[PDB]
Amino acid sequence: MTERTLKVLSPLHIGTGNELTPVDIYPRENIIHVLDTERLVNDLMNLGELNEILALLKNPPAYIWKGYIEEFHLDPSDYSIYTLKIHGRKSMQIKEFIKLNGRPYIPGSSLKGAIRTAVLYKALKECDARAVMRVVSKVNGDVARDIGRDVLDYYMSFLSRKRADDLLEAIVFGMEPDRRSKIRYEPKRDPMKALIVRDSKPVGRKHLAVYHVEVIGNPQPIPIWVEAIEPGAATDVEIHVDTEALRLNADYFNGLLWECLKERGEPGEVFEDFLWEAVDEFYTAVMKYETIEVQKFSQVRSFYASLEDHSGHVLRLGWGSGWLAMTIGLLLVEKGYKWENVRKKLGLGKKGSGFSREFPKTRRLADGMPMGWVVLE
RNA sequence: GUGGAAAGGCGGGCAGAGGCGGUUUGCGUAUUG
């Protein structure tokens, strides 16, 4: 297949590491507006200075620093998003979406990193009796992975910026020759270098709006303002596997993922079929796991029961996907105390350690919708 | 009322042929002051 289009079922924020200060914004109505400082500042000179360089650096009481253009001028906006929520007293930092010409698209590095989490989950399920024969070749540390006994039961005690997944990515994707440690990752040995995803077509201005993300898990909830693609927008993305790049590397790949493909048939032929069966088994499993916790908001469960009977492949993206959806640690729930000492080793809570709500405490949902759901087919 | 007189060290010759700046890594998560 080529040009496998998608749709959007919840708010979806792909960050760019940038926020809109209140000098960029003046909401005249329930609609909001993104003013053009470079053009507006250079357009407010004809009527005259050094006052703009003094007032913007001062940041006084925002509202008046954007409504002072209303005196003898008006109508200087760029994008003019919608607020779509009962907020905005400016006092906000709207996190902006990634845009190529002021037009929102989905980056392909972000949809590949979600498939890579789904594919990593499938490799650690099926592959401890076969995980030693992978590291039997030029690693010599599989005896430690055999005496502990499913390499996960060793890695909880093996650990006991952050390079925590360094060995686990080197077992499922790329066995190296040697290192100062036991093994390391080699980018030249990877089936995922044959997985080609591309940036999608740009979404559109009509489907972009500001949101009001409330954080739930504490008695005092906090709001975060953010912009995200509204649910119901459908764009098209093309994903294909280059099978010719796997035929050349039939002897050079050394990993547990390659030892999941030689059992479904020809390993350069079933990798694209293994790929989506890994998607609908990581993300349906994190979909069912969130029906256990009812701390959110009621209506959240009526979204999750409606995610079933929906054709296509369902997966998370973006910013509101929690620790449960960007991490192997869905599989590390069934350990309990084997992961309880290690979750405090890294540490989590700050400003000692969170005892009973260590990992799953935060839920970031926009307008009562669990954000970040995109369904391919 | 000179061991002198005259006599180009030079005519021809591409530092050339082959070679991907490359492979993996989701602007995000954690909690409060």
Side-chain angles (χ1 to χ4, degrees), chain A residues 1-40 48 55 60-62 67 76 88-127 129 131 141 144 148 164 170 174 177 183-293 298-336 347 349 352 354 360-377:
Chain A
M1 293 76 166
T2 186
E3 191 256 332
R4 289 200 285 265
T5 184
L6 55 86
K7 64 175 72 175
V8 174
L9 275 71
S10 68
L12 190 272
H13 172 70
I14 307 295
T16 184
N18 207 169
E19 288 84 5
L20 271 68
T21 66
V23 79
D24 300 329
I25 303 167
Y26 185 68
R28 286 88 178 271
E29 291 180 353
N30 54 4
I31 202 77
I32 65 100
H33 297 269
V34 177
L35 317 179
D36 322 288
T37 37
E38 292 63 8
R39 179 180 300 270
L40 185 295
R89 297 290 91 192
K90 304 297 181 184
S91 65
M92 65 184 179
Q93 296 297 324
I94 295 173
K95 293 183 179 181
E96 62 178 1
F97 194 84
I98 182 167
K99 294 182 286 288
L100 75 161
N101 198 1
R103 295 289 306 275
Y105 71 102
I106 294 172
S109 70
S110 180
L111 196 147
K112 188 172 174 66
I115 297 172
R116 185 178 178 88
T117 189
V119 172
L120 178 57
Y121 180 72
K122 191 72 177 296
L124 268 300
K125 289 178 76 68
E126 294 292 326
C127 292
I183 55 173
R184 60 179 295 275
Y185 188 78
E186 286 183 357
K188 301 182 289 293
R189 295 180 185 267
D190 194 2
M192 297 300 289
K193 79 192 283 186
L195 189 269
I196 289 174
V197 298
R198 285 168 173 167
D199 294 335
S200 65
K201 265 66 184 300
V203 179
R205 301 289 183 87
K206 282 90 172 65
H207 296 283
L208 200 281
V210 188
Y211 285 89
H212 184 74
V213 173
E214 193 174 4
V215 171
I216 284 92
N218 52 2
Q220 184 59 255
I222 73 172
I224 301 169
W225 289 266
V226 73
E227 69 183 7
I229 298 172
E230 67 187 3
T235 62
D236 48 352
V237 66
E238 53 184 357
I239 302 170
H240 63 269
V241 173
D242 186 74
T243 61
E244 183 65 30
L246 288 90
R247 295 179 180 176
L248 296 172
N249 288 311
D251 193 76
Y252 191 73
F253 286 158
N254 196 0
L256 290 175
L257 200 157
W258 189 252
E259 299 178 355
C260 292
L261 300 173
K262 296 175 75 171
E263 289 81 3
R264 292 178 184 269
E266 183 181 2
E269 195 269 331
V270 175
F271 174 72
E272 197 270 333
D273 199 0
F274 178 79
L275 190 66
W276 299 104
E277 293 175 353
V279 169
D280 291 331
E281 287 291 328
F282 176 74
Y283 290 103
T284 56
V286 75
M287 188 185 296
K288 292 177 71 175
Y289 184 78
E290 293 175 351
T291 59
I292 286 93
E293 284 83 2
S298 65
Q299 187 60 255
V300 173
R301 187 177 294 110
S302 176
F303 180 74
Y304 286 164
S306 299
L307 284 174
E308 298 294 325
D309 198 358
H310 185 75
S311 177
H313 303 288
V314 187
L315 60 95
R316 298 299 291 265
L317 292 179
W319 180 73
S321 66
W323 186 79
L324 292 168
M326 300 179 59
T327 289
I328 308 168
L330 179 63
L331 191 63
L332 299 176
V333 173
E334 289 84 3
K335 287 182 178 174
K361 189 174 180 180
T362 301
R363 296 292 185 268
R364 292 186 299 272
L365 70 158
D367 286 331
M369 294 297 172
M371 58 182 291
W373 291 98
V374 175
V375 174
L376 290 169
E377 71 268 15

Short mmCIF file of all heavy atoms in Angstrom, two decimals, chain A residues 15-16 110 185 187 317 319 326 348 350 362 364, chain B residues 22-33, unseen atoms left out:
data_model
loop_
_atom_site.label_atom_id
_atom_site.label_comp_id
_atom_site.label_asym_id
_atom_site.label_seq_id
_atom_site.Cartn_x
_atom_site.Cartn_y
_atom_site.Cartn_z
N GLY A 15 4.44 18.82 19.84
CA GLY A 15 5.10 20.02 20.30
C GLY A 15 6.25 20.45 19.42
O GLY A 15 6.81 19.64 18.69
N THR A 16 6.60 21.74 19.48
CA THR A 16 7.81 22.22 18.84
C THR A 16 8.76 22.87 19.84
O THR A 16 9.80 23.40 19.43
CB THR A 16 7.48 23.21 17.72
OG1 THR A 16 8.68 23.60 17.04
CG2 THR A 16 6.85 24.43 18.28
N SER A 110 7.77 11.42 14.47
CA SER A 110 6.89 11.22 15.61
C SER A 110 5.94 10.06 15.43
O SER A 110 5.48 9.49 16.42
CB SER A 110 6.09 12.49 15.87
OG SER A 110 5.23 12.31 16.98
N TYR A 185 24.27 -0.61 21.24
CA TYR A 185 23.44 -0.52 20.04
C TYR A 185 24.32 -0.26 18.83
O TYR A 185 25.32 0.46 18.91
CB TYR A 185 22.41 0.60 20.21
CG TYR A 185 21.35 0.69 19.14
CD1 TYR A 185 20.28 -0.19 19.11
CD2 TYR A 185 21.41 1.67 18.16
CE1 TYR A 185 19.32 -0.11 18.13
CE2 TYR A 185 20.44 1.75 17.17
CZ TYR A 185 19.40 0.87 17.17
OH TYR A 185 18.44 0.96 16.19
N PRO A 187 23.44 1.11 15.02
CA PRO A 187 22.43 1.55 14.04
C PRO A 187 22.48 0.84 12.70
O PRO A 187 21.48 0.85 11.97
CB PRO A 187 22.76 3.03 13.89
CG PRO A 187 23.35 3.41 15.18
CD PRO A 187 24.17 2.24 15.60
N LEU A 317 -0.10 9.16 19.77
CA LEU A 317 0.95 10.07 19.34
C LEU A 317 1.02 11.20 20.35
O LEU A 317 0.30 11.22 21.35
CB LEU A 317 0.70 10.64 17.95
CG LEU A 317 0.75 9.79 16.69
CD1 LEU A 317 0.44 10.67 15.51
CD2 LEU A 317 2.12 9.19 16.54
N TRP A 319 1.48 14.46 22.79
CA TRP A 319 1.92 15.02 24.05
C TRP A 319 1.11 14.54 25.24
O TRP A 319 1.63 14.53 26.35
CB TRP A 319 1.82 16.54 23.96
CG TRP A 319 2.23 17.30 25.15
CD1 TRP A 319 3.49 17.50 25.60
CD2 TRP A 319 1.35 17.95 26.06
NE1 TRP A 319 3.46 18.26 26.74
CE2 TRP A 319 2.15 18.54 27.05
CE3 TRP A 319 -0.03 18.09 26.14
CZ2 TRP A 319 1.61 19.27 28.10
CZ3 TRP A 319 -0.56 18.81 27.18
CH2 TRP A 319 0.25 19.38 28.14
N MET A 326 4.23 5.66 26.24
CA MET A 326 5.52 5.98 25.57
C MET A 326 6.57 5.19 26.33
O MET A 326 7.63 5.77 26.65
CB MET A 326 5.84 7.48 25.65
CG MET A 326 4.79 8.36 25.01
SD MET A 326 5.17 10.12 25.15
CE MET A 326 6.76 10.18 24.31
N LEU A 348 10.94 9.82 41.03
CA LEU A 348 9.83 10.36 40.21
C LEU A 348 9.28 11.65 40.82
O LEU A 348 9.45 12.72 40.19
CB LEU A 348 8.75 9.32 40.06
N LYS A 350 8.79 15.05 43.02
CA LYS A 350 9.75 16.10 43.44
C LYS A 350 9.03 17.35 43.98
O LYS A 350 7.84 17.55 43.68
CB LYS A 350 10.69 16.44 42.32
N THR A 362 -0.45 11.25 36.93
CA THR A 362 -0.89 12.35 36.09
C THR A 362 -1.72 11.83 34.92
O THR A 362 -1.36 10.84 34.29
CB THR A 362 0.33 13.12 35.57
OG1 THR A 362 1.08 13.63 36.68
CG2 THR A 362 -0.06 14.28 34.65
N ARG A 364 -3.38 13.83 31.56
CA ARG A 364 -3.53 15.09 30.83
C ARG A 364 -4.58 14.86 29.76
O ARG A 364 -4.31 14.24 28.73
CB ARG A 364 -2.20 15.53 30.23
CG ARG A 364 -1.16 15.94 31.25
CD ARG A 364 0.06 16.51 30.56
NE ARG A 364 0.68 15.52 29.70
CZ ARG A 364 1.59 14.64 30.10
NH1 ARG A 364 1.99 14.64 31.37
NH2 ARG A 364 2.10 13.77 29.25
P G B 22 23.60 12.00 4.64
OP1 G B 22 22.94 12.59 3.45
OP2 G B 22 23.45 12.61 5.98
"O5'" G B 22 23.13 10.49 4.74
"C5'" G B 22 23.81 9.48 4.02
"C4'" G B 22 24.33 8.42 4.94
"O4'" G B 22 25.63 8.80 5.47
"C3'" G B 22 23.51 8.12 6.18
"O3'" G B 22 22.40 7.28 5.90
"C2'" G B 22 24.53 7.46 7.11
"O2'" G B 22 24.69 6.09 6.79
"C1'" G B 22 25.82 8.19 6.73
N9 G B 22 26.19 9.22 7.72
C8 G B 22 25.95 10.57 7.66
N7 G B 22 26.42 11.20 8.70
C5 G B 22 27.00 10.21 9.47
C6 G B 22 27.66 10.30 10.72
O6 G B 22 27.88 11.30 11.41
N1 G B 22 28.10 9.06 11.15
C2 G B 22 27.92 7.88 10.48
N2 G B 22 28.42 6.79 11.08
N3 G B 22 27.29 7.79 9.32
C4 G B 22 26.86 8.98 8.88
P U B 23 20.96 7.63 6.51
OP1 U B 23 19.99 7.62 5.40
OP2 U B 23 21.07 8.78 7.43
"O5'" U B 23 20.60 6.36 7.39
"C5'" U B 23 21.24 5.13 7.19
"C4'" U B 23 21.31 4.36 8.48
"O4'" U B 23 22.65 4.43 9.01
"C3'" U B 23 20.45 4.90 9.60
"O3'" U B 23 19.09 4.53 9.50
"C2'" U B 23 21.15 4.38 10.85
"O2'" U B 23 20.74 3.05 11.11
"C1'" U B 23 22.62 4.37 10.41
N1 U B 23 23.41 5.49 10.98
C2 U B 23 24.52 5.14 11.71
O2 U B 23 24.85 3.98 11.88
N3 U B 23 25.25 6.18 12.22
C4 U B 23 24.98 7.52 12.08
O4 U B 23 25.73 8.35 12.60
C5 U B 23 23.82 7.81 11.32
C6 U B 23 23.11 6.81 10.81
P U B 24 17.95 5.53 10.02
OP1 U B 24 16.72 5.29 9.25
OP2 U B 24 18.52 6.90 10.06
"O5'" U B 24 17.72 5.09 11.53
"C5'" U B 24 17.59 3.72 11.87
"C4'" U B 24 17.83 3.50 13.34
"O4'" U B 24 19.22 3.75 13.65
"C3'" U B 24 17.08 4.41 14.28
"O3'" U B 24 15.74 4.02 14.48
"C2'" U B 24 17.92 4.32 15.54
"O2'" U B 24 17.67 3.10 16.21
"C1'" U B 24 19.33 4.26 14.96
N1 U B 24 19.98 5.59 14.92
C2 U B 24 20.51 6.10 16.09
O2 U B 24 20.48 5.53 17.17
N3 U B 24 21.10 7.33 15.98
C4 U B 24 21.22 8.10 14.84
O4 U B 24 21.78 9.19 14.91
C5 U B 24 20.66 7.52 13.67
C6 U B 24 20.08 6.31 13.75
P U B 25 14.62 5.15 14.67
OP1 U B 25 13.31 4.49 14.87
OP2 U B 25 14.80 6.10 13.56
"O5'" U B 25 15.03 5.91 16.01
"C5'" U B 25 14.85 5.31 17.28
"C4'" U B 25 15.51 6.12 18.36
"O4'" U B 25 16.82 6.54 17.91
"C3'" U B 25 14.81 7.42 18.75
"O3'" U B 25 13.79 7.20 19.71
"C2'" U B 25 15.95 8.28 19.29
"O2'" U B 25 16.19 8.00 20.66
"C1'" U B 25 17.16 7.79 18.48
N1 U B 25 17.58 8.72 17.41
C2 U B 25 18.63 9.56 17.71
O2 U B 25 19.18 9.56 18.79
N3 U B 25 19.02 10.41 16.70
C4 U B 25 18.47 10.49 15.45
O4 U B 25 18.92 11.30 14.65
C5 U B 25 17.39 9.58 15.21
C6 U B 25 16.99 8.75 16.17
P G B 26 12.30 7.75 19.41
OP1 G B 26 11.33 6.77 19.95
OP2 G B 26 12.22 8.13 17.98
"O5'" G B 26 12.19 9.08 20.27
"C5'" G B 26 12.03 10.39 19.66
"C4'" G B 26 10.75 10.51 18.83
"O4'" G B 26 9.86 9.42 19.14
"C3'" G B 26 9.96 11.82 18.97
"O3'" G B 26 10.19 12.61 17.79
"C2'" G B 26 8.49 11.38 19.12
"O2'" G B 26 7.54 11.72 18.13
"C1'" G B 26 8.53 9.85 19.07
N9 G B 26 7.81 9.25 20.18
C8 G B 26 8.34 8.73 21.34
N7 G B 26 7.44 8.25 22.15
C5 G B 26 6.24 8.45 21.49
C6 G B 26 4.91 8.13 21.88
O6 G B 26 4.52 7.59 22.92
N1 G B 26 3.99 8.52 20.91
C2 G B 26 4.30 9.13 19.72
N2 G B 26 3.27 9.42 18.92
N3 G B 26 5.53 9.43 19.35
C4 G B 26 6.45 9.07 20.27
P C B 27 9.71 14.16 17.67
OP1 C B 27 8.30 14.17 17.20
OP2 C B 27 10.74 14.90 16.91
"O5'" C B 27 9.68 14.73 19.16
"C5'" C B 27 9.67 16.16 19.37
"C4'" C B 27 9.36 16.53 20.81
"O4'" C B 27 10.40 17.38 21.34
"C3'" C B 27 8.01 17.21 21.09
"O3'" C B 27 7.31 16.24 21.84
"C2'" C B 27 8.34 18.39 22.02
"O2'" C B 27 7.65 18.43 23.26
"C1'" C B 27 9.84 18.27 22.26
N1 C B 27 10.57 19.63 22.13
C2 C B 27 11.48 20.01 23.12
O2 C B 27 11.69 19.23 24.07
N3 C B 27 12.11 21.20 23.01
C4 C B 27 11.84 22.00 21.98
N4 C B 27 12.49 23.17 21.91
C5 C B 27 10.90 21.64 20.97
C6 C B 27 10.30 20.46 21.09
P G B 28 5.71 16.22 21.97
OP1 G B 28 5.23 15.05 21.21
OP2 G B 28 5.11 17.55 21.72
"O5'" G B 28 5.53 15.88 23.51
"C5'" G B 28 5.57 14.54 23.95
"C4'" G B 28 6.80 14.24 24.77
"O4'" G B 28 7.90 15.13 24.42
"C3'" G B 28 6.67 14.43 26.27
"O3'" G B 28 5.97 13.39 26.89
"C2'" G B 28 8.12 14.51 26.70
"O2'" G B 28 8.71 13.21 26.69
"C1'" G B 28 8.73 15.32 25.56
N9 G B 28 8.82 16.76 25.89
C8 G B 28 8.19 17.78 25.23
N7 G B 28 8.45 18.95 25.74
C5 G B 28 9.30 18.69 26.79
C6 G B 28 9.90 19.58 27.71
O6 G B 28 9.80 20.82 27.76
N1 G B 28 10.70 18.91 28.64
C2 G B 28 10.88 17.56 28.67
N2 G B 28 11.68 17.09 29.64
N3 G B 28 10.32 16.72 27.82
C4 G B 28 9.54 17.34 26.91
P U B 29 4.43 13.60 27.28
OP1 U B 29 3.68 12.96 26.17
OP2 U B 29 4.18 15.02 27.60
"O5'" U B 29 4.28 12.76 28.62
"C5'" U B 29 5.02 11.56 28.80
"C4'" U B 29 6.08 11.70 29.86
"O4'" U B 29 7.05 12.72 29.48
"C3'" U B 29 5.61 12.14 31.23
"O3'" U B 29 5.06 11.06 31.96
"C2'" U B 29 6.88 12.72 31.85
"O2'" U B 29 7.69 11.69 32.38
"C1'" U B 29 7.59 13.31 30.63
N1 U B 29 7.44 14.78 30.53
C2 U B 29 8.36 15.58 31.21
O2 U B 29 9.26 15.11 31.89
N3 U B 29 8.17 16.93 31.07
C4 U B 29 7.19 17.57 30.33
O4 U B 29 7.15 18.80 30.30
C5 U B 29 6.29 16.68 29.66
C6 U B 29 6.45 15.36 29.79
P A B 30 3.90 11.30 33.05
OP1 A B 30 3.32 9.98 33.38
OP2 A B 30 3.01 12.37 32.56
"O5'" A B 30 4.69 11.83 34.33
"C5'" A B 30 5.67 11.02 34.95
"C4'" A B 30 6.54 11.80 35.90
"O4'" A B 30 7.29 12.82 35.20
"C3'" A B 30 5.84 12.58 36.99
"O3'" A B 30 5.33 11.77 38.04
"C2'" A B 30 6.92 13.55 37.42
"O2'" A B 30 7.92 12.86 38.17
"C1'" A B 30 7.54 13.91 36.07
N9 A B 30 6.98 15.09 35.52
C8 A B 30 6.10 15.21 34.49
N7 A B 30 5.78 16.45 34.21
C5 A B 30 6.50 17.19 35.12
C6 A B 30 6.59 18.57 35.34
N6 A B 30 5.92 19.47 34.61
N1 A B 30 7.40 19.00 36.33
C2 A B 30 8.07 18.09 37.04
N3 A B 30 8.07 16.77 36.93
C4 A B 30 7.26 16.37 35.94
P U B 31 3.75 11.74 38.29
OP1 U B 31 3.37 10.53 39.06
OP2 U B 31 3.12 11.98 36.97
"O5'" U B 31 3.46 13.00 39.22
"C5'" U B 31 3.63 12.92 40.63
"C4'" U B 31 4.50 14.04 41.13
"O4'" U B 31 5.17 14.69 40.01
"C3'" U B 31 3.79 15.18 41.85
"O3'" U B 31 3.51 14.89 43.21
"C2'" U B 31 4.75 16.35 41.66
"O2'" U B 31 5.82 16.27 42.59
"C1'" U B 31 5.31 16.07 40.26
N1 U B 31 4.60 16.82 39.19
C2 U B 31 4.91 18.15 38.99
O2 U B 31 5.74 18.76 39.64
N3 U B 31 4.21 18.76 37.98
C4 U B 31 3.25 18.20 37.16
O4 U B 31 2.70 18.87 36.30
C5 U B 31 2.99 16.82 37.43
C6 U B 31 3.66 16.20 38.40
P U B 32 2.63 15.90 44.10
OP1 U B 32 1.93 15.09 45.13
OP2 U B 32 1.84 16.79 43.21
"O5'" U B 32 3.72 16.78 44.86
"C5'" U B 32 3.38 18.04 45.42
"C4'" U B 32 4.02 19.15 44.63
"O4'" U B 32 3.31 19.33 43.38
"C3'" U B 32 4.00 20.53 45.27
"O3'" U B 32 5.03 20.71 46.23
"C2'" U B 32 4.14 21.45 44.06
"O2'" U B 32 5.49 21.50 43.63
"C1'" U B 32 3.33 20.69 43.01
N1 U B 32 1.86 21.20 42.93
C2 U B 32 1.59 22.26 42.09
O2 U B 32 2.45 22.80 41.41
N3 U B 32 0.28 22.67 42.06
C4 U B 32 -0.77 22.14 42.78
O4 U B 32 -1.91 22.60 42.68
C5 U B 32 -0.39 21.04 43.64
C6 U B 32 0.88 20.61 43.69
P G B 33 4.78 21.65 47.52
OP1 G B 33 5.84 21.36 48.52
OP2 G B 33 3.35 21.52 47.91
"O5'" G B 33 5.01 23.13 46.98
"C5'" G B 33 6.25 23.51 46.39
"C4'" G B 33 6.09 24.73 45.50
"O4'" G B 33 4.78 24.70 44.87
"C3'" G B 33 6.19 26.08 46.21
"O3'" G B 33 6.82 27.03 45.35
"C2'" G B 33 4.73 26.46 46.42
"O2'" G B 33 4.51 27.85 46.54
"C1'" G B 33 4.09 25.90 45.16
N9 G B 33 2.76 25.60 45.30
C8 G B 33 2.18 24.60 46.05
N7 G B 33 0.87 24.58 45.98
C5 G B 33 0.54 25.62 45.13
C6 G B 33 -0.73 26.09 44.69
O6 G B 33 -1.85 25.65 44.98
N1 G B 33 -0.62 27.19 43.83
C2 G B 33 0.57 27.76 43.45
N2 G B 33 0.49 28.80 42.62
N3 G B 33 1.75 27.34 43.86
C4 G B 33 1.68 26.27 44.70
#
